[PDB]
Design a protein around this ligand. Structure first.
Ligand SMILES: *[C@H]1O[C@H](CO)[C@@H](O)[C@H](OC)[C@@H]1O
Length: 27
């Protein structure tokens, strides 16, 4: 199990890699 700063998804949303998702522009 590992988690990163920010993971992009669909080139619009981000994830904590732990189970969190939120709209982002690019960490
Ligand atoms: C967190 O680090 C892990 C190291 O093994 C890696 O497997 C995982 O890949 C989603 C994530 O980068």
């Amino acid at each position: 199990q590992t988690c990163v700063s920010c993971v992009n998804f669909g080139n619009g949303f981000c994830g904590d890699n732990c189970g969190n998702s939120w709209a982002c522009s690019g960490c």
